[PDB]
């Protein structure tokens, strides 16, 4: 279980140029990362990293994309950050 | 005037709908009385969903990948667990 670090990335946009593997009975792991990718340069994703979670910010997001994220995440553990008006 | 909060971590959020997007944010539109949304997440009509965190625990690979693909254009933040080089720094004779 060591040496092992659990961290959060910065909040950045446009994560791409990486692949994942695993899942089901296993965790989700980064398989490959393209050298010049946002994955590498902005998120510092590395081969072998376990993605414990992803937080998606619903800012300037297409309705259909937000909807599909909610639909595909539906069976699993999630946490919402909400803004609520006080009357 | 308004408050920002986080739900508990729970599985199976359903029995609700959303609206908005694009220029606007994403808002909760109808919440079924008898729903996980109401009972586990305490979602209410009019709540803005600022973000969703999905935990990749017992997640079907194809569902996780679709989330990452649909998320691609947008602001995200990952929680990562990284194994780091083991090394042997023996010092003893
Ligand atoms: K897609």
Swiss-Prot record, chain A:
Residues 4-85 form the PDZ domain. It comes from the Eukaryota. It is found in: Nucleus. There is a cross-link at residue 8 (Glycyl lysine isopeptide (Lys-Gly) (interchain with G-Cter in SUMO2)). Coiled coil: none annotated. Homodimer (via PDZ domain). Interacts with DYSF; the interaction is direct and Ca(2+)-independent. This is Protein AHNAK2. The gene is AHNAK2.
């Amino acid at each position: 279980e060591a040496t092992e670090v659990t961290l959060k990335t910065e909040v950045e946009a446009g994560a791409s140029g990486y692949s994942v593997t695993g899942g089901g009975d296993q965790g989700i792991f980064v398989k490959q990362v393209l050298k010049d990718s946002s994955a590498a340069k902005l998120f510092n994703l590395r081969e072998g990293d376990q993605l414990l979670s992803t937080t998606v910010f619903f800012e300037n997001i297409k309705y259909e994309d937000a909807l599909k994220i909610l639909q595909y995440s539906e069976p699993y553990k999630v946490q919402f950050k909400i803004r609520r008006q006080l009357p």
